[PDB]
């Protein structure tokens, strides 16, 4: 029932070595997801990469990337407390609600490209971008997950080869699925999905624009060597239709705002101290205090 300052609700996945549970922060009331890894059943050399990745994850601060809130360690279990993407995966939205119009696709594909660039600019490659890591918040906004983990977590969207080019392909496939509503390289067996992915030959539906087709080509080049850079593709005509004086730019992080008196007053009323709060936010130790500060500004 309880972990940290979090009441546990219901399980929402069970990968290899990791299981995610939906939860409810008692102090603030807000809603969160919690990845639970058993350290028991781990190669000690892997923990050197687990925590290494947890370091990167703390550095991720983008509106379309799942933010870390609190870390809770016991010698047995690691609890990672994250954002919950309430609306769920994108392809369950594309099967259920059909294809997206180029306006909606554009909106969502900007958020994606912003996030992936920012992460590339911090030398992070997902290399596993797929159906399950593209998510949506309540307000229908992209939330990319497990970006920077190499875990077991909880083939179509991957390149004909199988750093940044592995994702460029992946983005191309995603763009296709957004506008078309279907996978470019699907099928029954996995000997089939090679033939289609390796040819890269897709079908261009009648409703897809010429501009959209054009940008699709930039992404899905069969030689990674000639594939276009996200830096460039941010300037594509298609990507910036309807965003005239808002041409897509690389995401730059906000300043620290660790001095919100109104939140601190509340936290003081929760039993924390001014010193505890200051020490905790500065050191960025992702403790009960840092979490409570972030959740208190979430909505």
Curated annotation (Swiss-Prot):
Superkingdom: Eukaryota
Annotated coiled-coil segments of the chain: none
Binding-site positions, ATP: 12-20, 35
Record keywords, A-Z: ATP-binding, Cell cycle, Cell division, Cell projection, Cilium biogenesis/degradation, Cytoplasm, Cytoskeleton, Kinase, Mitosis, Nucleotide-binding, Phosphoprotein, Serine/threonine-protein kinase, Transferase, Ubl conjugation
Active-site residues, Swiss-Prot/TrEMBL: 128 (proton acceptor)
UniProt GO MF annotations: ATP binding; cytoskeletal anchor activity; gamma-tubulin binding; microtubule binding; protein serine kinase activity; protein serine/threonine kinase activity; tau protein binding; tau-protein kinase activity
Gene Ontology biological-process entries: cell division; cilium organization; intracellular signal transduction; microtubule bundle formation; microtubule cytoskeleton organization; nervous system development; positive regulation of cell cycle; positive regulation of cilium assembly
Domain UBA: 253-297
Domain Protein kinase: 6-239
Primary location class: cytoplasm
UniProt keyword annotation of Lipid metabolism present: no
Posttranslational modification: Ubiquitinated with 'Lys-29'- and 'Lys-33'-linked polyubiquitins which appear to impede LKB1-mediated phosphorylation. Deubiquitinated by USP9X. Phosphorylated throughout the cell cycle.
Tissues where the protein occurs: Ubiquitous. Isoform 2 is brain-specific. Expressed at highest levels in brain and testis. Also expressed in heart, lung, liver, muscle, kidney and spleen.
Locations listed in the record: Cytoplasm, Cytoskeleton, Microtubule organizing center, Centrosome; Cytoplasm, Cytoskeleton, Microtubule organizing center; Cytoplasm, Cytoskeleton, Cilium basal body; Cytoplasm, Cytoskeleton, Cilium axoneme
GO terms for cellular component: centrosome; ciliary basal body; cytoplasm; cytosol; dendrite; gamma-tubulin complex; microtubule cytoskeleton; microtubule organizing center
Family membership noted in the UniProt record: Belongs to the protein kinase superfamily. CAMK Ser/Thr protein kinase family. SNF1 subfamily.
Physiological role: Serine/threonine-protein kinase. Phosphorylates the microtubule-associated protein MAPT/TAU. Also phosphorylates the microtubule-associated proteins MAP2 and MAP4. Involved in regulation of the microtubule network, causing reorganization of microtubules into bundles. Required for the initiation of axoneme extension during cilium assembly. Regulates the centrosomal location of ODF2 and phosphorylates ODF2 in vitro. Plays a role in cell cycle progression, specifically in the G1/S checkpoint. Reduces neuronal cell survival.
Quaternary data: Interacts with MAPT/TAU. Interacts with gamma-tubulin. Interacts with ODF2. Interacts with USP9X. Interacts with YWHAQ. Interacts with NLRP3; promoting NLRP3 recruitment to microtubule organizing center (MTOC).
UniProt-recorded name of the protein: MAP/microtubule affinity-regulating kinase 4
